[PDB]
Ligand binder design. Structure first.
Ligand SMILES: O=S1(=O)N=C(Nc2ccccc2N2CCCC2)c2c(Cl)cccc21
Lengths: 250, 293
């Protein structure tokens, strides 16, 4: 209804204006509107900081020195404005990001800019998304955002991926396990149990099975190990990508 | 009557060209939305507007708990065709894809306050910079990252960034970035040459391979969601993920994936991906996959 929504808009404007809500008799439509004009004629940096933890900075394109840096650089990077002022962007950025920096600060070919780089805060670097334009200078806002080891196998059981924690859990280099089947490192008694687990994980697609067997270490001792595994499915084709195992000692 | 209603339009934070032209109900809506936004700004806070609003690749949205978009940044027009006056005060569900309304709702509530999602909004502008009528409205995917904040009610204050289409792109492309084409199961069907100079793979030896085999296992979950989003909305931006390098080690990457539709039969043809190399080869001595041997 037109009258119902318009009246609801008027009474909501009553509730928002303090000098109008404090009144006892709700004034007529002409009065509240004039009282609202007077309220507004009497009276977003934090919105960006609240939304994405971003800070504005203006840098020179040729030298790289900053010509402005907002105070929001302290909440986002724990760095004073004096630390940024009088310095170049190349100092506040990871050493392996200066080549990328130049290609974004080069006004030879260009304008908009968008890039990611690691900035120093506090030798700790944080990932910052920098979006801005050219005005030379760049006006941009930068915003913020061993008991086991995980392995991946094909359906047969061939290591196709091994994380570095294997060198501590079993003592093998990742290259030692890769290319070979997991049952080759299994005790012959428990070998049939391991193949049975690999038969179920495929059959119980998506479900998590758990087998416990003796794993041959590089020192050639049988370390008891619980391997909890499950099949990984492609979110589109539902093809079994691999079998993800988390092999935990004892 | 008209003269006093014409006065509030002048006093709204708008240019006189667009404010002196709306109806009375729109003036009331905009006034109420501005007052609620100021009431919230008094809570969050204990010229240079051009620099902040122009250097943004997105728009700021302050949406109430019931879905009322009490604040929308001006640049929203630049990204959506629908401008500030036409959308401020209206419900977010009246201008968003219904298949995303449940996720929008579960992101509007509530004890973590950070929010990061992808949502499809009505877009009535074309790549030629020409605005189109609302009836011809496409669905534009927006990565919305923000916070939920309680004040006096609850509000979602987010920055919504569009994901640039790889065909219609206008941003210096760093030499530390490379393009790749995939099938819908994310298998390589084409790759750029720079992958040889950045990660070490030759573009031939990646074709027909599942990309699920070339990244670190610790990222496996965080990738699936991306794929699903990329398959559900047609566009996604992944997080920082480690792609296993050729001769050992891994490289940090952030990828913007876009579902490309065939222009003649309107069927999904492939998925185009712009990958931003975020570091050099880390742990290059350590091998992880069988392909690193
Ligand atoms: O082999 S990868 O490291 N995995 C990739 N992506 C990937 C893998 C599985 C699921 C989803 C994705 N994405 C879709 C869009 C965001 C990332 C990838 C890419 Cl898209 C390009 C080059 C190298 C690699």
């Amino acid at each position: 209804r037109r009258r119902n929504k318009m009246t609801a808009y008027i009474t909501e404007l009553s509730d928002m204006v303090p000098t109008c809500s404090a009144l006892a008799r709700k004034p007529d439509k002409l009065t509240i509107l004039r009282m609202a004009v007077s309220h507004m004629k009497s009276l977003l940096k934090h919105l960006i900081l609240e939304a994405a933890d971003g800070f504005l900075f203006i840098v020179s394109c040729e030298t790289g020195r900053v010509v402005y840096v907002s105070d929001s650089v302290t909440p986002v990077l724990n760095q004073p404005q004096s630390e940024w002022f009088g310095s170049t962007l190349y100092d506040q950025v990871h050493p392996d990001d200066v080549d990328k920096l130049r290609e974004q600060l080069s006004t030879s070919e260009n304008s908009r800019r968008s890039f990611i780089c690691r900035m120093r805060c506090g030798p700790h670097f944080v990932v910052v998304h920098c979006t801005g334009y050219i005005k030379f200078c760049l006006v941009a806002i930068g915003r913020l955002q061993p008991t086991e080891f995980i392995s991946r196998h094909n359906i047969e059981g061939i290591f196709t991926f091994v994380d570095h924690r294997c060198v501590a859990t079993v003592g093998y280099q990742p290259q030692e396990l890769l290319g070979k089947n997991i049952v080759e490192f299994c005790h012959p008694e428990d070998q049939q149990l391991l193949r049975d687990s690999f038969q179920q994980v495929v059959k119980l697609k998506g479900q998590v099975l758990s087998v416990m067997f003796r794993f041959r270490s590089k020192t050639r001792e049988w370390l008891w190990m619980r391997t909890s595994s499950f099949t990984f499915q492609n979110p589109y084709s539902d093809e079994i990508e691999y079998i993800i195992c988390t092999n935990t000692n004892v | 009557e008209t003269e006093v209603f014409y006065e509030l339009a002048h006093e709204l934070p708008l240019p006189h060209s667009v404010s002196s032209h709306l109806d009375k109900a729109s003036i009331m809506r905009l006034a109420i939305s501005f007052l609620r936004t100021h009431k919230l700004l008094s809570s969050v806070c204990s010229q240079m507007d051009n620099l902040y609003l122009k250097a943004l690749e997105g728009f700021i949205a302050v949406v109430t708990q019931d879905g009322d978009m009490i604040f929308l940044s001006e640049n929203i027009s630049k990204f959506m065709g629908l401008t500030q006056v036409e959308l401020t005060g209206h419900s977010i569900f009246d201008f968003t894809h219904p298949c995303d309304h449940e996720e929008i709702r579960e992101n509007l509530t509530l004890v973590s306050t950070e929010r990061d999602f992808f949502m499809r909004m009505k877009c009535t502008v074309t790549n030629r910079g020409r605005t189109v009528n609302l009836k011809s409205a496409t669905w534009k995917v927006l990565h919305c990252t923000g916070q939920v904040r309680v004040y006096n009610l609850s509000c979602l204050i987010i920055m919504c960034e569009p994901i640039q289409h790889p065909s219609h792109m206008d941003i210096p492309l760093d030499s530390k970035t490379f393009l790749s084409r995939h099938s819908m199961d994310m298998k390589f069907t084409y790759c750029d040459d720079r992958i040889l100079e950045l990660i070490g793979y030759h573009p031939e030896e990646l074709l027909g391979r599942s990309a699920y085999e070339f990244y670190h296992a610790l990222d496996s979950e965080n990738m699936t969601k991306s794929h699903q989003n990329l398959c559900t909305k047609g566009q996604v931006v992944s997080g920082q993920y480690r792609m296993l390098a050729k001769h050992g080690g891994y490289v940090w990457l952030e990828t913007q994936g876009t579902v490309i539709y065939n222009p003649r039969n309107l069927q999904p043809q492939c998925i185009m991906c712009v990958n931003y190399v975020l570091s050099e080869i880390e742990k290059n001595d350590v091998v992880f996959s069988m392909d690193q041997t």
